[PDB]
Automatic annotation (TrEMBL):
This is Lactoperoxidase. GO terms for molecular function: calcium ion binding; heme binding; lactoperoxidase activity; thiocyanate peroxidase activity. Its main location: cytoplasm. Heme b 1 binds at residues 105, 108, 114, 258, 348, 351, 440. Heme b binds at residue 351. Keywords: Antibiotic, Antimicrobial, Calcium, Cytoplasm, Disulfide bond, Heme, Hydrogen peroxide, Iron, Metal-binding, Nitration, Oxidoreductase, Peroxidase, Phosphoprotein, Secreted, Signal, Zinc. It comes from Bos mutus. The chain holds residues 118 to 712 of 712 of the full protein. One of its GO terms (cellular component) is cytoplasm. The keyword Signal applies. It is found in: Cytoplasm; Secreted.
Length: 595
């Protein structure tokens, strides 16, 4: 009765009964529907796609084609009028460390990646899009409004290329266009290990049966590993400093070097795998390389799950946590674990938590050198500042001692991302992540703000006064009505992020609902969830309960003082204790077995 078949790329693998570990692809997690949550398949649709032609063309593609009787505003004009601000004074979150932002980006990279269409190779398509700003097939350029300064300094557009879609990637089909999730839907440390067998093997050290991940052979951090380099050319990390010539890192996720603190967090996770593999080898000398790798991978997946659900989500969702994510009751094989298309926009709330600067701090939590503090835009695809300017410890100290940006209806996205974003192959620090998010909402066929309010059982404002009430902000509602003309047309990214945050949380009610529903699904629909009986033993679960980001730092850096609650705002020295007082992960329950 349905077109359920379509999975034409079809990374098809048969499933082995009673297999002890996760697949790299996420296949075989659900026994009845083994592709559920596997990588390189369609993002789930919680609601039907909304395209100007019903099938594939974004709203805004055809100038004369209205949405609900009104032209959709230019993404860059919404960015300029609503999202932008000048003054960074007073914008920081007084109760969230910068690790709060950074953990969000890490979790996001574990869960979803909808990359730009490949569209063949060695052609004049990408250059054409960038050079002449001509909309066509996959070229969906972000056009500058008449009063945009970038129209004066940067040409007529910011190049933008439509996301990849499942069955054919160049041609189309009879159903609506469905974008791809290139990573595993499960919270499974796919950002460390990869979501594809080829990358997963490339990341491993298969020279020794020690179960290790490959490490950098060119540079070391006071005896501790860096990720290997990606020696693919051209390299955006080389591009931004051709004197230093330091390549990007190779990780489980394609995007690991996008900014210096994401590369930092990736480095901690790689180190933690190798520490666990060494410690398991000492405990279990007869375990082979495959077994050591899998058991360390399983522990690192559980770490990521526990930090996320115990420490992170409660301070994102605040009062809505118990509504959307009740205490775990067990694996439910009827739950759809696939990441939804809308979730990939909902989780971009993080863009409003990114502050304008990154600091390096020394062994006394004092400024590291004469340029301790640097503008964020100079740190896009920046790996040389790690290798050649103190390794990761000074950056990790900044992650603990400095703050996230607080979402603000009058100060949404810092100009470091809104005007100075660097994109690989596009040469300039001149892109706008907010405009890109809005253009991508349309590229993906997103239903508008009121469709999602209805989905979440919330009021659907129809008038300026109704929107002013929901947003608790007259001027913001007025600016959104002036541009969108009806709240039905407001793009979900800006509408969800415009709502005032729930008590004890950092998102409003619409985003709490969309995020909370997704995180409930990826937990309840995961046969390898850490708390599911038989994944770990009772004694292993008791040991895992004691994981902390503070212990991760103590174990995989030379930092000797850390806070106990690393996601809150912490000040040195008052909130910092000796590493020796921080709980350890007791691996004794991983003994092959005893009597
Ligand atoms: C995968 O996992 C393997 C290990 O299982 C990694 O292999 C090892 O890499 C490190 C470098 O990253 C190598 O260490 C070097 O060691 C020498 C000291 O050599 C002596 O001790 C070694 C350790 O036991 C041993 O392997 C050596 O034996 C080999 O070489 C001799 C000839 O010297 C030969 O007779 C033997 O038969 C072996 O072939 C030897 O006993 C040390 O001198 C090196 O340091 C120098 O170089 C670094 C920069 O490179 C510099 O910082 C120093 O100041 C100095 O200049 C270096 O520490 C180790 O030898 C490798 N082990 C094996 C078995 O080859 C591998 O790197 C992992 N790969 C990835 C991609 O992660
Ligand atoms: C640079 C960028 C960041 C930090 C300096 C950053 C940060 C975050 C946080 C903190 C997130 C969540 C808590 C988060 C989520 C998602 N991002 Fe974003 N991000 C930076 C840069 C980008 C760029 C560039 C993109 C691609 C934009 C496009 O549409 O082409 C981007 C995306 C996302 C994303 C969607 C992932 C996907 O499914 O494809 C998040 C869920 N980020 N980032
Ligand atoms: C590119 O990287 C190099 C380091 O490899 C940076 O240079 C250092 O910068 C200051 C001088 O301005 C000094 O600490 C060193 O003498 C420099 N080293 C070298 C080799 O020149 C350089 O500033 C970076 N440039 C950019 C644009 O990021
Ligand atoms: C900071 O947030 C944490 C929860 O994230 C909370 O327990 C603590 O009371 C908050 N502190 C202040 C000062 O509000
Ligand atoms: C399992 O999932 C289905 C679909 O969400 C749900 O209707 C059912 O109540 C769930 N079973 C539980 C919570 O035991
Ligand atoms: Ca994953």
């Amino acid at each position: 009765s349905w077109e359920v078949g379509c999975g034409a790329p079809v990374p098809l693998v048969k499933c082995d009964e009673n297999s002890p570990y996760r697949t790299i692809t996420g296949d075989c997690n659900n026994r009845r529907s083994p592709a559920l949550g596997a990588a390189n398949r369609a993002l789930a649709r919680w609601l039907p796609a909304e395209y100007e032609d019903g099938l594939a063309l974004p709203f805004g593609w055809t100038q004369r084609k209205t949405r609900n009787g009104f032209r959709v505003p230019l993404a860059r004009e919404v960015s300029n009028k609503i999202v932008g601000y000048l003054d960074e004074e007073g914008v920081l979150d007084q109760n969230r460390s910068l690790l709060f932002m950074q953990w969000g980006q890490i979790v996001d990279h574990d869960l979803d990646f909808a990359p730009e269409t490949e569209l063949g190779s060695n052609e004049h398509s990408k250059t054409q899009c960038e050079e002449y700003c001509i909309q066509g097939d996959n070229c969906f350029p972000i056009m500058f409004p008449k009063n945009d300064p970038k129209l004066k300094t940067q040409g007529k557009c910011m190049p933008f290329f439509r996301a990849g879609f499942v069955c054919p990637t160049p041609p189309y089909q009879s159903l609506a266009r469905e974008q791809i999730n290139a990573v595993t839907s499960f919270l499974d440390a796919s950002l460390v290990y990869g979501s594809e067998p080829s990358l997963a093997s490339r990341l491993r050290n298969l020279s020794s049966p020690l179960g290790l991940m490959a490490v950098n052979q060119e540079a070391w951090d006071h005896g501790l590993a860096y990720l290997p380099f990606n020696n693919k050319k051209p390299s955006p990390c080389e591009f931004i400093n051709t004197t230093a010539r330091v390549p990007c890192f190779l990780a489980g996720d394609f995007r690991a070097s996008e900014q210096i603190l994401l590369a930092t967090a990736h480095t901690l996770l790689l180190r933690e795998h190798n520490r666990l593999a060494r410690e398991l080898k000492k405990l279990n000398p007869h375990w082979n390389g495959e077994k050591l790798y899998q058991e360390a991978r399983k522990i690192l997946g559980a770490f990521i799950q526990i930090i996320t659900f115990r420490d992170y989500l409660p301070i994102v969702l605040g009062s809505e946590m118990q509504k959307w994510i009740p205490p775990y009751q067990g694996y439910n094989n009827s739950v759809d674990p696939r990441i939804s298309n809308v979730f990939t926009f909902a989780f971009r709330f993080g863009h409003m938590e990114v502050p304008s600067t990154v600091s390096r701090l020394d062994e006394n939590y004092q400024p590291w050198g004469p340029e301790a503090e640097l503008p964020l835009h100079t740190l896009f695809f920046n790996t040389w500042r790690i290798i050649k300017d103190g390794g990761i410890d000074p950056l990790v100290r900044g992650l603990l001692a400095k703050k996230s940006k607080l979402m603000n209806q009058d100060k949404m996205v810092t100009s470091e991302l809104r005007n100075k974003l660097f994109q690989p192959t596009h040469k300039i620090h001149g892109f706008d992540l907010a405009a890109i998010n809005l253009q991508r909402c349309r590229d993906h066929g997103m239903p508008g703000y009121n469709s999602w309010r209805g989905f979440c059982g919330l009021s659907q404002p129809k008038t300026l006064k109704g929107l002013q009430t929901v947003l608790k902000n007259k001027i913001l509602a007025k600016k959104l009505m002036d541009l969108y003309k009806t709240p039905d047309n407001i793009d979900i990214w800006i509408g969800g992020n415009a709502e005032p945050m729930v008590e004890r949380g950092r998102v409003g009610p619409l985003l709490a609902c969309l995020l909370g529903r997704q995180f409930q699904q990826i937990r309840d629909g995961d046969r390898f969830w850490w708390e599911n009986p038989g994944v770990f033993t009772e004694k292993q679960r008791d040991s895992l309960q004691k994981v902390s980001f503070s212990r991760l730092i103590c174990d995989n850096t030379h930092i000797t003082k850390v806070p106990l609650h690393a996601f809150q705002a912490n000040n040195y020295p008052h909130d910092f204790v000796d590493c020796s007082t921080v709980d350890k992960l007791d691996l004794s329950p991983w003994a092959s077995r005893e009597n």
